[model samples]
Target: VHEFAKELDATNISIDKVVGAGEFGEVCSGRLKLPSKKEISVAIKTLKVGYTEKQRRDFLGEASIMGQFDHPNIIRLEGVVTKSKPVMIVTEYMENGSLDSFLRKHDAQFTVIQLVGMLRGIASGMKYLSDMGYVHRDLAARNILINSNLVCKVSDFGLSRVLPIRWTSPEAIAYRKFTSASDVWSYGIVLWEVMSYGERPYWEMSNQDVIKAVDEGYRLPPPMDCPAALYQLMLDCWQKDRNNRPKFEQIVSILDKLIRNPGSLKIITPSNLLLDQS
Candidate 1:
């Protein structure tokens, strides 16, 4: 652990409520107290009891990586609790939760510029990670957290390389190769998810089918109301040749252009079949 991250005593961290389930065990909302009696809200990721050596290593690996990152758009790690009953990794709490769930609940509420701003923030964070030689194998909206101010910070490193077939790259799905280019591929799907208001990518396609379809060059269609320029960028990120895909720096530049020229984003009217009645 870095000097910034302390080895927190498990007793000083109180689990207030269960937030969700993580890869190894339960993710909970909690409070951590300092020796000086200061208390702060935190998200605690617990490793399951009776975990194997691999499980323990995998669980701690993410925290080790996150402790070094200090980017504003990346999740912050508070510390870890290892010498206790339940091994836990503590992080700063995101009040609004995952970006996918938040967008689903408020579909069509944000303006084009607002959504672009969110994407810009994510791209900025990814740029930082890439510059640091870190590849976030998973870069979908589900892994991007939203705070009370609606700031989007990239999160969920534990499952970055292990899951989410729809957001995965062709090379990663076929050969298990994960690179920054593969992350760009996943970023395309994330752009689709955000523009589509958190719709599940590929709908009900099986993992096998999704992989086969991508191998056959079947890219996802532009989401309803998605700006033409933005959709074009998403398509660029989906290029089969990893070398043809844009880097995070390029992506950030493209998003910066779109955000500055919001008028270029042509919002399509909802189709009759796609109209929401809820």
Candidate 2:
């Protein structure tokens, strides 16, 4: 346990409020005093009391991995509290919470370029993770946090490998193999979610139906008023052949191009249903 991370004394931690329910237990915004006695706002995830040994290890496993990352676009870990009851994983608090709910609550409040900027940050963080030889396994809006500045930072590293139905790719679902390319496929879905202001992917499509539909070459339709260029890029990310999908490096570059020429985002394309071009 000592080797995994620095353990903070429970005495110095004070929970202010529960923000949301996490996989293990309750998540909260709290105050943590540093060794020098400086108080700072932090998010603390508590492990359920009476949890099994596996649950304890699984909950702490994220801290073991999360403590290794350092990036403006990645969630930061403060430390762990394993020495006392109700073990906790403490990290910096995000004022805006996760991107999905954030965009939902403040629907269409941002320009296309602002949305593109958020994507760029997420891409850079994914690129950094790719370069570091790590796979996020779960990379969706729910896992991407937003600070007060509207900066999106990737978070949530669950120990379990249960696939997120709509957000996942066919190959990964079939072969149980995940890679950076698989992440790009998920990124495309995230792009749609952003454009649509957090509408659930596939709406009412069942998990089995989504798997079957996507396996049969059905990609999601573009979100309302999504730019043609952006939709095309989303399709590129959803390419059936994972190898054909753009690398995170190339994704970053593509978004850079769109952001540099904001007018490109103004050209909305009619859905294929209108043209029946397929």
Best by TM-score: 2
| Stretches of model 2 off by over 4 angstroms after superposition | 159-163, 270-278
* Candidate 1: 10-residue stretch with minimal lDDT: 269-278
Candidate 1 residue-wise lDDT, 157-219, digit = tens = 765442178999998888888888889898888898899889888888788888887787777
- Deviating ranges (above 4 Å) for candidate 1: 1-5, 34-38, 159-163, 267-278
Please, what are the lDDT tens digits per residue for candidate 2 over residues 78-143?
899887878999999899999999899978788999999998999998888777778777888888
Q: How many backbone clashes does candidate 1 have?
A: 0
Quote model 1's TM-score. Answer: 0.87
Residue 5 displacement (Å), model 2: 2.2
